[PDB]
Amino acid sequence: XXXXXXXXXXXXXXXXXXXXXXXXXXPRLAFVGFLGYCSGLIDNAIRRRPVLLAGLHRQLLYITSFVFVGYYLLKRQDYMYAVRDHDMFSYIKSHXXXXXXXXXXXXXXXXXXX
Amino acid sequence: NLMLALLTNFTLATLLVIIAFWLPQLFSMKFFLVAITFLLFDLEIALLLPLPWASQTANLNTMLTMALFLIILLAVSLAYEWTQKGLE
Amino acid sequence: MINILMLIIPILLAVAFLTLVERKVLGYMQLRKGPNVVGPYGLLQPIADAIKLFIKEPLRPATSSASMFILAPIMALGLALTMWIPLPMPYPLINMNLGVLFMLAMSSLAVYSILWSGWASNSKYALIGALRAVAQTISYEVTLAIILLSVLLMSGSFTLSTLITTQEQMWLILPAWPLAMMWFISTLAETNRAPFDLGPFALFFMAEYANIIMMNIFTAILFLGTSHNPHMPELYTINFTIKSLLLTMSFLWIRASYPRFRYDQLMHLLWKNFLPLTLALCMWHVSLPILTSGIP
Amino acid sequence: NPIIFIIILLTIMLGTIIVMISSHWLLVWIGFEMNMLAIIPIMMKNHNPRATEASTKYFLTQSTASMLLMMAVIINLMFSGQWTVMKLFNPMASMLMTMALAMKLGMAPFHFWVPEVTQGIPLSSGLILLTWQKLAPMSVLYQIFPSINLNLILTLSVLSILIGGWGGLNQTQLRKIMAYSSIAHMGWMTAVLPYNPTMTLLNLIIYIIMTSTMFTMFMANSTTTTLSLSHTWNKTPIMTVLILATLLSMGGLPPLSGFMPKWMIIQEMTKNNSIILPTFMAITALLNLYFYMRLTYSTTLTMFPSTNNMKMKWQFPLMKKMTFLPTMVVLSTMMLPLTPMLSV
Amino acid sequence: LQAEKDRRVLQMLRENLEEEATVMKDXXXXXXXXXXXXXXXXXXXXXXXXXXXXXXXXXXXXXXXXXXX
Amino acid sequence: ELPSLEDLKVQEVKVSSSVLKAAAHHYGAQCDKPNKEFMLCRWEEKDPRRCLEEGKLVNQCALEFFRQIKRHCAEPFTEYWTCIDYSGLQLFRRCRKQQAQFDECVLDKXXXXXXXXXXXXXXXXXXXXXXXXXXXXXXXXXXXXXXXXXXXXXXXXXXXXXXX
Amino acid sequence: MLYIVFILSVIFVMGFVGFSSKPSPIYGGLGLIVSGGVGCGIVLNFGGSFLGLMVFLIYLGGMMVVFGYTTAMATEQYPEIWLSNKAVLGAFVTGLLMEFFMVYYVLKDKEVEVVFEFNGLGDWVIYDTGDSGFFSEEAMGIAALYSYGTWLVIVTGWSLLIGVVVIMEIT
Amino acid sequence: QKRLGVDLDRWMTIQSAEQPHKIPSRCHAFEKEWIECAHGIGSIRAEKECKIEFEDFRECLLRQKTMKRLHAIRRQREKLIKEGKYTPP
Amino acid sequence: AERVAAFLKNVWAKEPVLVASFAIAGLAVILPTLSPYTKYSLMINXXXXXXXXXXXXXXXXXXXXXXXXXXXXXXXXXXX
Amino acid sequence: SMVYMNIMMAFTVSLVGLLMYRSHLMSSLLCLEGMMLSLFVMAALTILNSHFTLASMMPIILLVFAACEAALGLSLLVMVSNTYGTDYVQNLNLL
């Protein structure tokens, strides 16, 4: 859902629903953490400094900033996908007539030659 | 009538021109900065115009902080006019 | 509706008979005798100036651009005479829903009278001096709006009839002591030729001197009053005219006594010096009805 | 321009907040005018004969545009009554409203000012502001995306990539190429508005970051293709790798972050049974790539721009986020698959 | 306030008699359930109407800002 | 529309000319029960077609008020009426000296009562008439409240996108 | 005699023709005094004591007076007759005929329109307002207040601070 | 709004609100109907249930339904030239 | 004093009108907060009715009586 | 309804005036004033006839901002006459 109906408008993270549990040491977090390290490699390409890998130790600021913002950004990702599924399952339960079930068949299909 | 009152003054004013007309037979761009500041101040005056006619039903404590606020910024605009305006 | 003609014809006579006052009262200031030969005390001269300029005096225009030059005196005389309508007096002719807003509006449109005259001349020589004359009027209209509001915020709405009723025991000169000093100076900016100076040319005299009486009357409403008396219209009519005449003497006082302030230093008296002073008093006049109960 | 320049820049920042947090139709008109009075001084700055022409062209094409918006505001008083920025209600009001928004975002019949205004800025800092100003009227379109007739919104999207895809071909001025890169990307902006409101704002997140990285790479002064040509051999060679990476992402290419908006634009459109329109979007996207392809030949090829004058001293520009944001602009394909939901 | 509403009923009754006199033969206008689709609250109505006949009374009643006696 | 009868309500409406009614504020104190009940009916039910019966009593009580002043102490009432119309719209200014002649004659009767300050909104109900609470204009709630379920989502397995 | 506002609306358009046409900024400037002053009557007739006079104070006695300076500062070229110029007279005659042809259709009540809305007569229904309010009457009778709209006061003050600072920096 | 206001409120935008004085709007009787109908999410998004209440609200501001009605009466009164016509006022 | 006593007599000597622009406008902000008189003016502004007062139905109500003069509600009588 | 029919026609004339140019540049800024003048009449009448009380302040705010564009854009006009001889739409260098 795009427009809020049950969720509170303008939230820092969620706060209305907190129970979901965020991912711990996820493969998704590692890629954002890799980009934080990658940003601390190409910064020495702009301002000409000796060695991209073994240069200035202000790289720790670049890794942490990508992790801290990324953790909050992925927390919203797990939240928004949950709400999207929650409203989907509630739509089937309340209406029932919109959904139809079919199982087990013996229907003929056209066979291809050559 | 307001329409009858206004038109009588103009029609008598036009008649005085014809008397003299028919009867006898035989650069610097520094001025612009003054003109602009007139317009920008008068709009702050336009916002400060309702004060004697507005303050009758509304709460005074909510208005007091907001009424002075426009005049303060009207002085800040004049404070920017002190940091070299020119020879004018 | 006959009263409109009883507020143009005696008013045009008042602008005419000013020529006596403007050089006899000004005369005794300069120890010279004014009008004396023409009439018994020179009373025949004001009407004699009308016969001289209107009928016999011909025209020699610089270019005459179709509609203009023969349109600027209509705007000059028309706006000066329409200012008499919203005036409270003992009783006003067709009283407006809001009084002083009509007064400030027709004075701000009276700037055009000196604007179209600058466009009438084809030469660049005249228009630079013409725009300088606009600057004398346009700048002082900023403060004129501020000092008006401070008097209104003390007591009464925009209606001019309510301004007479609020002055029952004491004048508004005493509570508005620095503001009353401002109206003596700010009014002189509108082509009075006392702090600064720049056929159809004769018609401008009939319009410019008309505004002088207009500012004298308008100061005698905002600051003077003494008594109202609705039952007796006789007592108010005589007492109002004497108060206005005393302010007319002060208008001719500045013209004789004091030299011109320079155009550059006119923008040092105002803007640099007056605008911080007027707004500080405006700040004071916002707090006054809140500090002590004073709402119409 | 001392301390007060930051205050002038702050009023553009605060101006968009008025547009962002709004319920009244006259409040956004105030919000647009907060930008009008605050961009013009930065458009001038040094005062140039080219700057005077650009600022007047920027004013007249945009002030008249916002005046058309105020008509639609007043029709919302004549019809439907209420002063709310929820729905447009009247079809008569929407015709003047969408065209007023097209004067700032749609661009297909209102592009004319862009290549002259963007070129007319004497400074690199003014180039960022025009790519940041486009955020403001997008907030309006996100509020009133229903009721507005789709027949004359999608024409503003289809034609814009056509004129954007041809309008950069005969241009050597570096500011002019980026001016038509706006119109080309604005077609993708005015296409997701009828088909699912989400990812339309993420299109801005990809675009604004990608464009802000571009002009900050041009902090080492360059205004033409030949002036950006002398950069690999005479100037910093490692810097041109990041210019290459950002330009490749500007066009639709999968291993880069710039392909990730182009995913959902077609995906949400195909869900609404439309195939003939997204096909035309993909073919015209090739024309966009060609400008960046020729501009990557200043970074890849030799091109012989050696010159007698050589720089030895180290360059120190402003560079606010010219190190953190290009890393997101080069690679975010694996980083942002589920991030579509996070924005809206 | 009662004097306002007493006049509004009397002005409508004169309008109802004029509608019955004018519409008789060709037009199929019955004038029932009023102009409103809801027909439960009923607004001012005679603010715009106020009887079409006699212009001398209509000009003084509508215009108040003009002249202003 | 269904309009009221041609006979309507109140025979011979209003006493005489204006300002006369504005001169006496004693109309607030004496005869208030018909005025307040009409006021209570009209704000609850906005239609003039329903609460016209209470308005019939208002105009009838209006004649009862003016007749009492015309019978006893008519000389101070006529002199006060000439004072208020000679001036513009002062109402109480420059007429307070002639107001002293008024009320003093009325004080002999039980009719005299001063307003002093303000009404401060008085609440009184006795007649009620059908109570009247819900009428307004609306007929239906329209589709009622929208269906919304709350259970709290657990985790939701697998993302919708191609990359998972 | 019957109409009050409808006559003033014709003069309003009459002054506006010298804007689509190009009669120089001198004669074109004169149009805003004619259309503005008559335009106040359109506002004033339905009410609005304060708002009706604001056009005289700002639009007429402030806006166009500053425009009086700029005509002398830039492009003066000594004022010329707006009849001798080519295409100017053609734009003026076509401008009036778009509105004056509609004036002929006002007779017999109904008039043809490009818009879907019908015009009819509307003489007594032109105002479409009852007495209602008495003491402190009219919606425009208390038009402006600093209360409730506190946010609007701050931004207007902020925008007027920008104008003074910016225009000083350009010159 | 793309970003909503929290805690502090700065609105007074919609029709039928806490007015400056005690004086109410001209269409306030019809204004209340549109607010009470579209307070739920599934009413204006559907735009089928509130069709009757909106048309009565549209009748208040424009007065188009009353204008066409008064047009027919005024034309027929003009049509009765040299014929029987009602006159009392 | 380095700024209190030093930058006072110089301000009175050079540009003397600028003293009044800060003193009068400054005290215009200070006075309406500290002085105990502003609270009285707010009460009379709310007490004076602009429109007619509404009548409520009586069903167990305190400090509410008839239109005649009686001890009910607030009713302002502050200072004569 | 009836009064709105004329001022909407007056709005279209002022709209074309913005879009029309012959030599002079001053007409556009004069038309910007006229456009805001025509919008001022349209806004006032809708609030005055159909009462709002709170919303009657909105055209007063609109009156202030109308002058802001007609001064800050008007200031740019003088800058053209400093670089060039006189203001002309015909006199432009940008391509």
mmCIF file of N, CA and C in Angstrom, chain F residues 46-124:
data_model
loop_
_atom_site.group_PDB
_atom_site.id
_atom_site.type_symbol
_atom_site.label_atom_id
_atom_site.label_comp_id
_atom_site.label_asym_id
_atom_site.label_seq_id
_atom_site.Cartn_x
_atom_site.Cartn_y
_atom_site.Cartn_z
ATOM 1 N N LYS F 46 -32.600 23.714 11.869
ATOM 2 C CA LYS F 46 -32.294 24.905 11.063
ATOM 3 C C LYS F 46 -33.461 25.416 10.206
ATOM 4 N N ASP F 47 -34.404 24.526 9.892
ATOM 5 C CA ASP F 47 -35.583 24.857 9.084
ATOM 6 C C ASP F 47 -36.548 25.808 9.805
ATOM 7 N N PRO F 48 -36.982 26.891 9.117
ATOM 8 C CA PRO F 48 -37.995 27.806 9.662
ATOM 9 C C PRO F 48 -39.413 27.227 9.608
ATOM 10 N N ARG F 49 -39.590 26.166 8.819
ATOM 11 C CA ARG F 49 -40.883 25.506 8.606
ATOM 12 C C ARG F 49 -41.402 24.739 9.827
ATOM 13 N N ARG F 50 -40.489 24.328 10.708
ATOM 14 C CA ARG F 50 -40.828 23.514 11.881
ATOM 15 C C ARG F 50 -41.039 24.325 13.164
ATOM 16 N N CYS F 51 -40.172 25.311 13.400
ATOM 17 C CA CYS F 51 -40.208 26.119 14.626
ATOM 18 C C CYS F 51 -40.894 27.486 14.447
ATOM 19 N N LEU F 52 -41.828 27.559 13.496
ATOM 20 C CA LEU F 52 -42.624 28.772 13.255
ATOM 21 C C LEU F 52 -43.734 28.980 14.292
ATOM 22 N N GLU F 53 -44.149 27.887 14.937
ATOM 23 C CA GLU F 53 -45.182 27.898 15.980
ATOM 24 C C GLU F 53 -44.727 28.654 17.233
ATOM 25 N N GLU F 54 -43.450 28.496 17.586
ATOM 26 C CA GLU F 54 -42.829 29.234 18.690
ATOM 27 C C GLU F 54 -42.615 30.708 18.344
ATOM 28 N N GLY F 55 -42.350 30.979 17.063
ATOM 29 C CA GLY F 55 -42.188 32.341 16.542
ATOM 30 C C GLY F 55 -43.467 33.163 16.525
ATOM 31 N N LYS F 56 -44.609 32.472 16.499
ATOM 32 C CA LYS F 56 -45.936 33.086 16.601
ATOM 33 C C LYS F 56 -46.153 33.713 17.984
ATOM 34 N N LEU F 57 -45.617 33.057 19.014
ATOM 35 C CA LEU F 57 -45.688 33.529 20.398
ATOM 36 C C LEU F 57 -44.739 34.703 20.666
ATOM 37 N N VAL F 58 -43.656 34.782 19.888
ATOM 38 C CA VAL F 58 -42.645 35.848 19.997
ATOM 39 C C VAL F 58 -43.230 37.216 19.614
ATOM 40 N N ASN F 59 -43.902 37.267 18.462
ATOM 41 C CA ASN F 59 -44.522 38.491 17.945
ATOM 42 C C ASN F 59 -45.735 38.932 18.771
ATOM 43 N N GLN F 60 -46.444 37.960 19.348
ATOM 44 C CA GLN F 60 -47.597 38.217 20.218
ATOM 45 C C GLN F 60 -47.175 38.795 21.574
ATOM 46 N N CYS F 61 -46.050 38.308 22.102
ATOM 47 C CA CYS F 61 -45.468 38.814 23.351
ATOM 48 C C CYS F 61 -44.787 40.172 23.158
ATOM 49 N N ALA F 62 -44.355 40.444 21.925
ATOM 50 C CA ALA F 62 -43.759 41.728 21.538
ATOM 51 C C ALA F 62 -44.752 42.887 21.656
ATOM 52 N N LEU F 63 -46.010 42.625 21.298
ATOM 53 C CA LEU F 63 -47.104 43.590 21.441
ATOM 54 C C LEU F 63 -47.494 43.810 22.904
ATOM 55 N N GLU F 64 -47.338 42.765 23.720
ATOM 56 C CA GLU F 64 -47.628 42.805 25.161
ATOM 57 C C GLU F 64 -46.655 43.696 25.940
ATOM 58 N N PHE F 65 -45.409 43.756 25.471
ATOM 59 C CA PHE F 65 -44.353 44.564 26.089
ATOM 60 C C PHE F 65 -44.561 46.064 25.860
ATOM 61 N N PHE F 66 -44.835 46.441 24.609
ATOM 62 C CA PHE F 66 -44.998 47.846 24.213
ATOM 63 C C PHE F 66 -46.289 48.499 24.712
ATOM 64 N N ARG F 67 -47.334 47.690 24.898
ATOM 65 C CA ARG F 67 -48.629 48.163 25.406
ATOM 66 C C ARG F 67 -48.588 48.581 26.876
ATOM 67 N N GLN F 68 -47.734 47.918 27.657
ATOM 68 C CA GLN F 68 -47.544 48.218 29.082
ATOM 69 C C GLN F 68 -46.868 49.571 29.321
ATOM 70 N N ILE F 69 -45.962 49.945 28.416
ATOM 71 C CA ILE F 69 -45.247 51.229 28.475
ATOM 72 C C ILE F 69 -46.150 52.379 28.004
ATOM 73 N N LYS F 70 -47.025 52.090 27.039
ATOM 74 C CA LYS F 70 -47.978 53.072 26.507
ATOM 75 C C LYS F 70 -49.110 53.411 27.484
ATOM 76 N N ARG F 71 -49.458 52.455 28.347
ATOM 77 C CA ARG F 71 -50.491 52.640 29.372
ATOM 78 C C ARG F 71 -49.983 53.442 30.574
ATOM 79 N N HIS F 72 -48.836 53.031 31.118
ATOM 80 C CA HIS F 72 -48.226 53.682 32.282
ATOM 81 C C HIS F 72 -46.823 54.193 31.966
ATOM 82 N N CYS F 73 -46.585 55.463 32.308
ATOM 83 C CA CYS F 73 -45.339 56.201 32.020
ATOM 84 C C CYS F 73 -45.016 56.266 30.519
ATOM 85 N N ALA F 74 -45.775 57.104 29.813
ATOM 86 C CA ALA F 74 -45.611 57.317 28.372
ATOM 87 C C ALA F 74 -44.765 58.552 28.062
ATOM 88 N N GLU F 75 -44.825 59.543 28.954
ATOM 89 C CA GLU F 75 -44.070 60.799 28.829
ATOM 90 C C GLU F 75 -42.533 60.652 28.862
ATOM 91 N N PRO F 76 -41.972 59.798 29.763
ATOM 92 C CA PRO F 76 -40.513 59.598 29.685
ATOM 93 C C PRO F 76 -40.053 58.734 28.504
ATOM 94 N N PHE F 77 -40.943 57.877 28.001
ATOM 95 C CA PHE F 77 -40.650 56.980 26.878
ATOM 96 C C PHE F 77 -40.591 57.715 25.536
ATOM 97 N N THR F 78 -41.499 58.674 25.345
ATOM 98 C CA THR F 78 -41.575 59.479 24.117
ATOM 99 C C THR F 78 -40.403 60.466 24.021
ATOM 100 N N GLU F 79 -40.015 61.036 25.164
ATOM 101 C CA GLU F 79 -38.878 61.963 25.256
ATOM 102 C C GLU F 79 -37.533 61.277 25.012
ATOM 103 N N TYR F 80 -37.421 60.023 25.454
ATOM 104 C CA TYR F 80 -36.237 59.192 25.224
ATOM 105 C C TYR F 80 -36.130 58.747 23.762
ATOM 106 N N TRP F 81 -37.285 58.548 23.126
ATOM 107 C CA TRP F 81 -37.375 58.153 21.719
ATOM 108 C C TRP F 81 -36.989 59.290 20.765
ATOM 109 N N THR F 82 -37.296 60.526 21.158
ATOM 110 C CA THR F 82 -36.918 61.722 20.390
ATOM 111 C C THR F 82 -35.420 62.025 20.490
ATOM 112 N N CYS F 83 -34.821 61.661 21.625
ATOM 113 C CA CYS F 83 -33.390 61.853 21.890
ATOM 114 C C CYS F 83 -32.504 60.938 21.038
ATOM 115 N N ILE F 84 -32.917 59.678 20.899
ATOM 116 C CA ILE F 84 -32.143 58.656 20.181
ATOM 117 C C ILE F 84 -32.152 58.845 18.650
ATOM 118 N N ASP F 85 -33.238 59.415 18.128
ATOM 119 C CA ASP F 85 -33.412 59.632 16.686
ATOM 120 C C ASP F 85 -32.851 60.965 16.181
ATOM 121 N N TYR F 86 -32.717 61.939 17.084
ATOM 122 C CA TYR F 86 -32.124 63.246 16.772
ATOM 123 C C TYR F 86 -30.630 63.123 16.461
ATOM 124 N N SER F 87 -29.941 62.279 17.230
ATOM 125 C CA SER F 87 -28.543 61.925 16.980
ATOM 126 C C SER F 87 -28.452 60.788 15.956
ATOM 127 N N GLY F 88 -27.232 60.498 15.500
ATOM 128 C CA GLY F 88 -26.973 59.444 14.514
ATOM 129 C C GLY F 88 -27.192 58.047 15.060
ATOM 130 N N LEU F 89 -26.102 57.409 15.485
ATOM 131 C CA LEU F 89 -26.152 56.076 16.089
ATOM 132 C C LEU F 89 -25.252 55.962 17.325
ATOM 133 N N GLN F 90 -25.349 56.966 18.197
ATOM 134 C CA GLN F 90 -24.657 56.974 19.487
ATOM 135 C C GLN F 90 -25.324 56.011 20.469
ATOM 136 N N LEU F 91 -26.655 55.915 20.371
ATOM 137 C CA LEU F 91 -27.520 55.014 21.167
ATOM 138 C C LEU F 91 -27.591 55.314 22.671
ATOM 139 N N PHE F 92 -26.436 55.524 23.302
ATOM 140 C CA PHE F 92 -26.356 55.808 24.737
ATOM 141 C C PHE F 92 -25.548 57.065 25.069
ATOM 142 N N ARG F 93 -24.703 57.497 24.130
ATOM 143 C CA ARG F 93 -23.927 58.731 24.271
ATOM 144 C C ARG F 93 -24.774 59.970 24.000
ATOM 145 N N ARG F 94 -24.557 61.004 24.820
ATOM 146 C CA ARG F 94 -25.292 62.289 24.783
ATOM 147 C C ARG F 94 -26.817 62.156 24.945
ATOM 148 N N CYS F 95 -27.232 61.123 25.681
ATOM 149 C CA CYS F 95 -28.643 60.814 25.926
ATOM 150 C C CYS F 95 -28.849 60.212 27.325
ATOM 151 N N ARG F 96 -27.756 60.118 28.086
ATOM 152 C CA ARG F 96 -27.755 59.554 29.441
ATOM 153 C C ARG F 96 -28.463 60.451 30.465
ATOM 154 N N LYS F 97 -28.465 61.761 30.207
ATOM 155 C CA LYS F 97 -29.175 62.743 31.038
ATOM 156 C C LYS F 97 -30.695 62.602 30.923
ATOM 157 N N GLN F 98 -31.165 62.277 29.717
ATOM 158 C CA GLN F 98 -32.584 62.006 29.455
ATOM 159 C C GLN F 98 -32.984 60.577 29.844
ATOM 160 N N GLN F 99 -31.985 59.704 29.985
ATOM 161 C CA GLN F 99 -32.175 58.324 30.448
ATOM 162 C C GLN F 99 -32.527 58.264 31.941
ATOM 163 N N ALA F 100 -32.136 59.303 32.683
ATOM 164 C CA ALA F 100 -32.445 59.443 34.113
ATOM 165 C C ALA F 100 -33.942 59.628 34.388
ATOM 166 N N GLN F 101 -34.636 60.290 33.460
ATOM 167 C CA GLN F 101 -36.098 60.442 33.501
ATOM 168 C C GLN F 101 -36.803 59.107 33.252
ATOM 169 N N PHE F 102 -36.215 58.294 32.372
ATOM 170 C CA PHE F 102 -36.644 56.916 32.129
ATOM 171 C C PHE F 102 -36.186 56.015 33.282
ATOM 172 N N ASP F 103 -36.765 54.813 33.361
ATOM 173 C CA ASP F 103 -36.484 53.797 34.401
ATOM 174 C C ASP F 103 -37.006 54.162 35.798
ATOM 175 N N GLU F 104 -36.931 55.448 36.150
ATOM 176 C CA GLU F 104 -37.407 55.972 37.436
ATOM 177 C C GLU F 104 -38.932 55.871 37.568
ATOM 178 N N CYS F 105 -39.640 56.152 36.473
ATOM 179 C CA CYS F 105 -41.096 55.995 36.402
ATOM 180 C C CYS F 105 -41.482 54.516 36.336
ATOM 181 N N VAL F 106 -40.647 53.728 35.656
ATOM 182 C CA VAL F 106 -40.840 52.280 35.487
ATOM 183 C C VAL F 106 -40.561 51.520 36.796
ATOM 184 N N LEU F 107 -39.724 52.106 37.658
ATOM 185 C CA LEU F 107 -39.355 51.532 38.964
ATOM 186 C C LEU F 107 -40.539 51.397 39.933
ATOM 187 N N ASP F 108 -41.550 52.252 39.755
ATOM 188 C CA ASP F 108 -42.816 52.181 40.497
ATOM 189 C C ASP F 108 -43.561 50.871 40.211
ATOM 190 N N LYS F 109 -43.507 50.434 38.952
ATOM 191 C CA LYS F 109 -44.007 49.129 38.528
ATOM 192 C C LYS F 109 -42.916 48.067 38.739
ATOM 193 N N UNK F 110 -43.278 46.793 38.575
ATOM 194 C CA UNK F 110 -42.329 45.677 38.669
ATOM 195 C C UNK F 110 -41.684 45.366 37.333
ATOM 196 N N UNK F 111 -41.958 46.209 36.338
ATOM 197 C CA UNK F 111 -41.466 46.039 34.967
ATOM 198 C C UNK F 111 -40.002 46.364 34.806
ATOM 199 N N UNK F 112 -39.484 47.237 35.672
ATOM 200 C CA UNK F 112 -38.107 47.735 35.581
ATOM 201 C C UNK F 112 -37.103 46.705 36.026
ATOM 202 N N UNK F 113 -36.125 46.453 35.155
ATOM 203 C CA UNK F 113 -35.004 45.547 35.427
ATOM 204 C C UNK F 113 -33.837 45.947 34.564
ATOM 205 N N UNK F 114 -32.674 46.103 35.195
ATOM 206 C CA UNK F 114 -31.448 46.525 34.511
ATOM 207 C C UNK F 114 -30.620 45.338 34.100
ATOM 208 N N UNK F 115 -29.990 45.453 32.932
ATOM 209 C CA UNK F 115 -29.113 44.411 32.384
ATOM 210 C C UNK F 115 -27.777 44.377 33.083
ATOM 211 N N UNK F 116 -27.352 45.538 33.595
ATOM 212 C CA UNK F 116 -26.093 45.740 34.346
ATOM 213 C C UNK F 116 -24.853 45.536 33.502
ATOM 214 N N UNK F 117 -24.535 44.280 33.179
ATOM 215 C CA UNK F 117 -23.314 43.945 32.438
ATOM 216 C C UNK F 117 -23.625 43.193 31.164
ATOM 217 N N UNK F 118 -23.814 41.875 31.270
ATOM 218 C CA UNK F 118 -24.016 41.001 30.106
ATOM 219 C C UNK F 118 -24.905 39.826 30.425
ATOM 220 N N UNK F 119 -25.410 39.179 29.372
ATOM 221 C CA UNK F 119 -26.271 37.996 29.488
ATOM 222 C C UNK F 119 -25.491 36.762 29.867
ATOM 223 N N UNK F 120 -24.269 36.642 29.332
ATOM 224 C CA UNK F 120 -23.323 35.527 29.591
ATOM 225 C C UNK F 120 -23.835 34.157 29.174
ATOM 226 N N UNK F 121 -24.826 34.150 28.276
ATOM 227 C CA UNK F 121 -25.548 32.952 27.790
ATOM 228 C C UNK F 121 -26.271 32.199 28.883
ATOM 229 N N UNK F 122 -27.596 32.327 28.879
ATOM 230 C CA UNK F 122 -28.468 31.654 29.842
ATOM 231 C C UNK F 122 -29.086 30.435 29.214
ATOM 232 N N UNK F 123 -29.135 29.348 29.984
ATOM 233 C CA UNK F 123 -29.702 28.078 29.525
ATOM 234 C C UNK F 123 -30.988 27.790 30.251
ATOM 235 N N UNK F 124 -32.055 27.594 29.476
ATOM 236 C CA UNK F 124 -33.388 27.281 30.004
ATOM 237 C C UNK F 124 -34.178 26.496 28.992
#
